[PDB]
């Protein structure tokens, strides 16, 4: 009955309701704990054989939206597998994002094969610097590296207060591509409203960069550690910004349900759920300040 709940659950919020809702743990908790996680039944996968590709045995990609790696390799039976899902965006548009776990030593090459296959123009990495080499490895070179005949070069490193932006070139055969890599370093320990502005600013900077891709922007890869918590927060904020700007309302509950349908467990905790409301409440204030 979880599928039907996720299809119909909705809580349209107007501006005044949104500011109050963000500061209402009583209403937020009751709403959040009613949402099914939609975790994949482990029977869908050969759990013992995938231990080197999955960070957590209970966090699996929902088969229907799973990102399949089509590049051939007959020697490796796991070359087609990656713990990643296609995520619908604003107005249910298909493949707007890819939510995936932070690459591990054994999945760095798989991650770059996904980047190439999908023609990904933007990668959003959500961490803290103290979590490095643990919650996420440094899968990019200092200057240049070759993965699966794909030359990966870091052309520029742009340091900002809350993120490091890398301009990356990708080359294989006669093809040459560009990539924007946003390494967000200000994910907070405590999801208080004063910590929401860097997340909203990153969301809006990424949106402006996606606009520059023109129509038919290829999937934006978003990753944290398990690829559901912080990833869910970023993506829900990204979708709800477009909804607030175009419809003058936000439906965080419906957005969270659409995310859960695509990948089980998107937005893991009620603190993360409230954080999205804090970010949306702040965006409404920013919009009112130019109105
Ligand atoms: N719709 C897609 N395939 N990509 C995609 C396009 C957009 C643009 C933003 C400007 N309005 C038109 C849509 C924004 C984003 C995102 F916010 F995530 F960054 C992703």
DSSP of 89-114: -GGG-TTSEEEEPPP-TTTHHHHHHH
By alpha-carbon position, which residue is closest to atom 9 of ligand 1?
211
Place of tokens 């399949």: 68
Best mutation site among 242, 244, 247 for ligand 1, i.e. most ligand atoms within 8 A of its Cβ? 242
Question: What CA–CA distance (Å, rounded) separates 123 from 226?
Answer: 16
Pairing outcome for strands 220-223 and 150-159: unpaired
Q: Which DSSP string corresponds to 198-251?
A: HHHHHHHHHHHHHHTT-TTPPPEEEE-SSSSHHHHHHHHHHHHHHHHHHHS-B-
CB atoms within 10 A of CB 24: 15
Domain formed by 1-291, architecture: Alpha-Beta Complex (3.90)
Helix, strand, or coil here: 129? helix
Output the six-digit token pair for 50. 């995938």
In ligand 1, which atom is closest to the CA atom of 235?
A: 18
State yes or no: is 240 an active-site residue.
Answer: no
Count of C-beta atoms within a 10 Å radius of residue 88: 19
Tokens for 49, please give them: 């054989």
State in Å: Cα 122 to ligand 1 middle: 11
Give the residues surrounding ligand 1 with Cβ less than 6 Å away: 89, 93, 96, 206-207, 210-211, 217, 220, 238
d(CA 59, CA 42): 9
Three-state SS string over 142-186 comes to CCEEEECCEEEEEEEEEECCCEEEEEEEEEECCEEEEEEEEEECC
Per DSSP bridges, beta strands 175-184 and 122-126 are parallel
Indicate which residue's Cα is closest to atom 17 of ligand 1. 207
Cα 36 versus chain centre, distance: 19
The label of the residue with tokens 């979708």 reads 239
Burial class (CB in 10 A: 0-12, 13-18, 19+), 128: middle
* Phi, psi dihedrals of residue 51, rounded to the nearest 5°: -50, -35
Burial 174-204 (b: 16+ CB within 10 A, else e): eeebebbbbbbbbbeeebeeebbbbbbbbbe
Evaluated on CA atoms 276, 192, 289, 31, the torsion sign reads positive
Q: Which residues pair with 106 in a beta bridge?
A: none
The Å distance, Cα 217 to ligand 1 centre, comes to 7
Which of 123, 199, 204, 207 has most ligand 1 atoms within 8 Å of its beta carbon, as the pocket-test mutant?
A: 207
Q: How far apart are CA 133 and CA 129, in angstroms?
A: 9
Nearest atom in ligand 1 to 122's CA: 19
User: What is the rounded distance in angstroms from the CA atom of residue 241 to the CA atom of residue 49?
Assistant: 40
Helices (H) and strands (E) in the chain, counts: 8, 8
**How far is it, in rounded angstroms, from Cα 284 to Cα 270?**
21
Q: What are the boundaries of each domain within the chain? A: 1-291
Q: How was this structure determined?
A: X-ray
| Cα–Cα distances in angstroms (integers) from residue 188 to residues 77, 173, 230, 243, 287, in the given order | 39, 42, 10, 25, 24
Would you say 241 and 203 are in contact if contact means Cβ atoms under 8 Å apart? yes
Q: Which of 244, 191, 232 is nearest to 97 (CA)?
A: 232
Largest CA distance in the chain: 59
Bridge partner residues of 164 (DSSP): 159, 183
């Amino acid at each position: 009955s979880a599928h039907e709940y996720l299809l119909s659950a909705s809580r349209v919020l107007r501006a005044e309701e949104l500011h109050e809702k963000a500061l209402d743990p009583f209403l937020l908790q009751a709403e959040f704990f009613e949402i099914p996680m939609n975790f994949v039944d482990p029977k869908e996968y050969d759990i013992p054989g995938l231990v080197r590709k999955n960070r957590y045995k209970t966090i699996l990609p929902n088969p229907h939206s799973r990102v399949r790696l089509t590049s051939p390799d007959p020697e490796d039976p796991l070359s087609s597998y990656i713990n990643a899902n296609y995520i619908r965006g604003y107005s249910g548009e298909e493949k707007v994002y890819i939510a995936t776990q932070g690459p591990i030593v054994s999945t760095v090459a798989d991650f770059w094969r996904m980047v190439w296959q999908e023609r990904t123009p933007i990668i959003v990495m959500i961490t803290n610097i103290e979590e490095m080499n643990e919650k996420c490895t440094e899968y990019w070179p200092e200057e240049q590296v070759v993965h699966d005949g794909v030359e990966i070069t870091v052309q520029k490193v742009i340091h900002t207060e809350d993120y490091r932006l890398r301009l990356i070139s990708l080359r294989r055969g006669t093809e040459e591509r560009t990539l924007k890599h946003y390494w967000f370093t200000s994910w907070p320990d405590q999801k208080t409203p004063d910590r929401a502005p860097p997340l909203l600013h990153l969301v809006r900077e990424v949106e402006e960069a996606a606009q520059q891709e023109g129509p038919h922007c290829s999937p934006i890869i978003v990753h944290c550690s398990a690829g559901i918590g912080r990833t869910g927060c970023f993506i829900a904020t990204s979708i709800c910004c477009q909804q607030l700007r175009r419809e003058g309302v936000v439906d965080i509950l419906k957005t969270t349900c659409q995310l859960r349908q695509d990948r089980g467990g998107m937005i893991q905790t009620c603190e993360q759920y409230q954080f999205v409301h804090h970010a949306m409440s702040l965006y409404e204030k920013q919009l009112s300040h130019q109105s």
